[PDB]
Amino acid sequence: MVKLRLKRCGRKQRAVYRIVAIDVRSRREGRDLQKVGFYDPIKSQTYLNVPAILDFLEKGAQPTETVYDILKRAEVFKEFR
Amino acid sequence: SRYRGPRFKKIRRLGALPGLTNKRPRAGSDLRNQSRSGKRSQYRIRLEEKQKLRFHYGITERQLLKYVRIARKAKGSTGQVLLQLLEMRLDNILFRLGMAPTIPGARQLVNHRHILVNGRIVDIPSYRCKPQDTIMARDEQKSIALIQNSLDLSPREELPKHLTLNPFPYKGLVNQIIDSKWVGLKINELLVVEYYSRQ
Amino acid sequence: ITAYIPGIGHNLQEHSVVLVRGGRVKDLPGVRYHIVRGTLDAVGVKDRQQGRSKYGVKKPK
Amino acid sequence: MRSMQGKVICATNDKTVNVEVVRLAPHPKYKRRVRKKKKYQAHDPDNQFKVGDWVQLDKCRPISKTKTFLAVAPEGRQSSATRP
RNA sequence: UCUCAUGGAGAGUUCGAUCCUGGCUCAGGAUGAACGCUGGCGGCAUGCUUAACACAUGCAAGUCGGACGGGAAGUGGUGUUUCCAGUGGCGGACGGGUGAGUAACGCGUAAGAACCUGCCCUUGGGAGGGGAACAACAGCUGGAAACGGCUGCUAAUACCCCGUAGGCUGAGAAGCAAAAGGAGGAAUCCGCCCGAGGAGGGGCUCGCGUCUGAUUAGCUAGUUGGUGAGGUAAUAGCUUACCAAGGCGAUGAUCAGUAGCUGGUCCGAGAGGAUGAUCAGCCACACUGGGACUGAGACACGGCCCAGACUCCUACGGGAGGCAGCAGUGGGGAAUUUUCCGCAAUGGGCGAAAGCCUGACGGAGCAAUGCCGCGUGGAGGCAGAAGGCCCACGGGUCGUGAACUUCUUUUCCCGGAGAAGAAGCAAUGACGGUAUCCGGGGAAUAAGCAUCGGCUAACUCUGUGCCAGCAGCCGCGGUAAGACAGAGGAUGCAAGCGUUAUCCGGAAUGAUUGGGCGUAAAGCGUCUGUAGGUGGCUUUUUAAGUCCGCCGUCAAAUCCCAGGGCUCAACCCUGG
């Protein structure tokens, strides 16, 4: 199954995540095939390219809890269906 | 990570260092020891030219050798680009403006949180100040007195073109990038590059 | 193998545990190793001030 | 370019023909083009090939152990018998 | 007078002396480091390279009562409700650890055809009617224990049959194939059966690249090839019977030895050399070997069966177990850590949901192991004095150094305030009263290590007398030692400094770039010739090599350029 989650890469006690689509059984720092966003809680900035994300969601990609919340604040679901 | 020693002991042998202290040596001690020293080797001449940078800026070889790599990566006049990194240090800029009598004296002011840059405190004597950067003191009367005492209790040297001063805040401002001919120390930069040719 | 005893004076005797390092002595053919002073059983050199780290000797105080 | 040509020596076996392939490639240390050789096994169900002929190979699903190619005719040749 | 180029240093030693040739040695940088002396703090990282030796103790994979029957607790021994040993469903094939084995489709790269694929997404059609069991449980019974035995009863999304079919078999006629219900103010969600697709994942095949040795030259017999009969999810000697005699190799077969591979790491002027820790991907292994079941998926680290070695329990009949999971112990070794806190975040599994589990992961602690950063005071200090060393005995040096006087408080001590990280109305923080800010006190809390014959920056005196001893090379010391030891002084580094070990460079000393063979090491005693290498001139053909323009790909991280963010840097992030 394909899934939209986020991996950690940064400094200790300074979390800086990036959104990416990879297989579920792969580990957190797994081989990527398409990076589709960037996010951090401290600065609270987000690019979140929509054309790539909709390509996976049409094919059955299931977001996680927080990635659902990130996409919820965006209006991507209304144009997705 | 600091000298903490006598300075005239080196100025007799090394050369002249206005950056360290404007004082001068007293005695041409003995003709005997000058006869003992005599000539000098080429490696020693390249060595003594390097040591002048170790005192005029208060820097370590590890801290210095890093700047050598940045100059080698930078294209054109690696000797000149080296001084562009040293002269832009905060410890030199606060000195050349005249806010302290000695660069070690200026290094202390930076360490004990007496100066701020662009509205923020800077506790790093090795901070690289960019063009169009403001340098102001803090609001405490202790901080204001130390800079005010430096600008009042003795004459002031003519400043460069790339530095200004507003006497109402007692502050400064960096205009542009330095030229290699406005260094505050008589240098032969090429010999320094010849010393680090091995490394 | 056989090693060299650097320094002046030693307390080593048969059935003692030493710690060997590299380095050869040209003047002695066949010797290609040195022992460390200030270790398991080899003690530091007595009355030594200069070059004190090369022989395992405490600093005077 | 895409597929490999070869000479069809040792065509004795049934429904199969051994084939010798040749290629040139530069030596990595000295950059000289050396003539290397490698053999393969193909199949011609019509048995339309014999020793001395020129043959082209194609990829296909495996027929047996070490025989994983198909023998076809050459595409680009330069016979040009007695042109002005 | 453009632009490109940011990059190549040598020194000593053969001789009485010189020019060469040729080895040895040094100056550089790096490390999963170790030892020695010394030692203030902070930030980011790292931490069994040896015995894949053996392991005490605790934890590391559970979850659903909204699938089912029973049982327990509580209550007003009554309703709701809470808990679960068993049946059933999903996950236990992910994640974690380790490189023993492996020289080959294992890895990397670039292509293919004869296949599978639970969960997710999309989509076309269905779920009708009946029956029989094992658990649990009840009774009896055998054992020291682990675990059982017998006799009867029972539910289900568990089992079986019938019926139906856009599917399967076949040339066709014909033959065969299913399902499960649960929750509910009833709209109606979670599911089940058949079939066709998408994505991801996995299996198979192939081109190219992929260590050493010729004092290993012949190897293979299901071996190369076919047919028929088999078999696998699928192609295939994958298996078998017969037939044919091929298949590999001197461009290195076979045999032997070594080794996880790669992105990358280090060195280098470059070409290239060495290397495969941390991070990331693939493969392989799970006490040593063999085998299979289950399932969409295994020949399964914390699953089962058998054999073997070892350890533990035993009532001696018989049983239990596999830290190359976290932490930790013993042992080996020069040498590498707490038997810690928490699921707050990230991610994973189950569940309709609430929530449960998660030694993965996120944090703390130990270590100067490494990289980076800041201190161990600034300024002034007239003249003179004590003291150490040296002297041509007049003086010189240690030395503005110290004393002394003022100034400041990173750091230090005391006392307060105090987060972000949390995404989700509110609440929800292991770290943590952590970072951080304000106030008070006061130079108060903080420098050592090596070297000083030449290479190689830095010198005298005393002592010793080829003695004690130094040394990387040349070599110093035999009574005035700049080479030993001490002292003073100096130089170079700096919370580090040196020694040793390992790799590269220097080394043009394996010379493609970039060497040589008259006498310094080097032309077979000579000739003929196989393979192989190269090959005269002129006009055409093709476009394999070669050159140009586009497309795809060589992951991310790292390196390079730019930009931004941590008070700067290391470092982190964005883009190319």
Ligand SMILES: [Mg+2]
């Ligand atoms: Mg440092």
Ligand SMILES: [Mg+2]
């Ligand atoms: Mg001589």
Ligand SMILES: [Mg+2]
């Ligand atoms: Mg190991």
Ligand SMILES: [Mg+2]
């Ligand atoms: Mg259910």
Ligand SMILES: [Mg+2]
């Ligand atoms: Mg239960």
Ligand SMILES: [Mg+2]
């Ligand atoms: Mg399953």
Ligand SMILES: [Mg+2]
């Ligand atoms: Mg039926």
Ligand SMILES: [Mg+2]
């Ligand atoms: Mg076989």
Ligand SMILES: [Mg+2]
């Ligand atoms: Mg066949």
Ligand SMILES: [Mg+2]
């Ligand atoms: Mg191995």
Ligand SMILES: [Mg+2]
């Ligand atoms: Mg070179």
Ligand SMILES: [Mg+2]
């Ligand atoms: Mg073991």
Ligand SMILES: [Mg+2]
């Ligand atoms: Mg398992």
Ligand SMILES: [Mg+2]
């Ligand atoms: Mg285990």
Ligand SMILES: [Mg+2]
């Ligand atoms: Mg362990």
Ligand SMILES: [Mg+2]
């Ligand atoms: Mg959690």
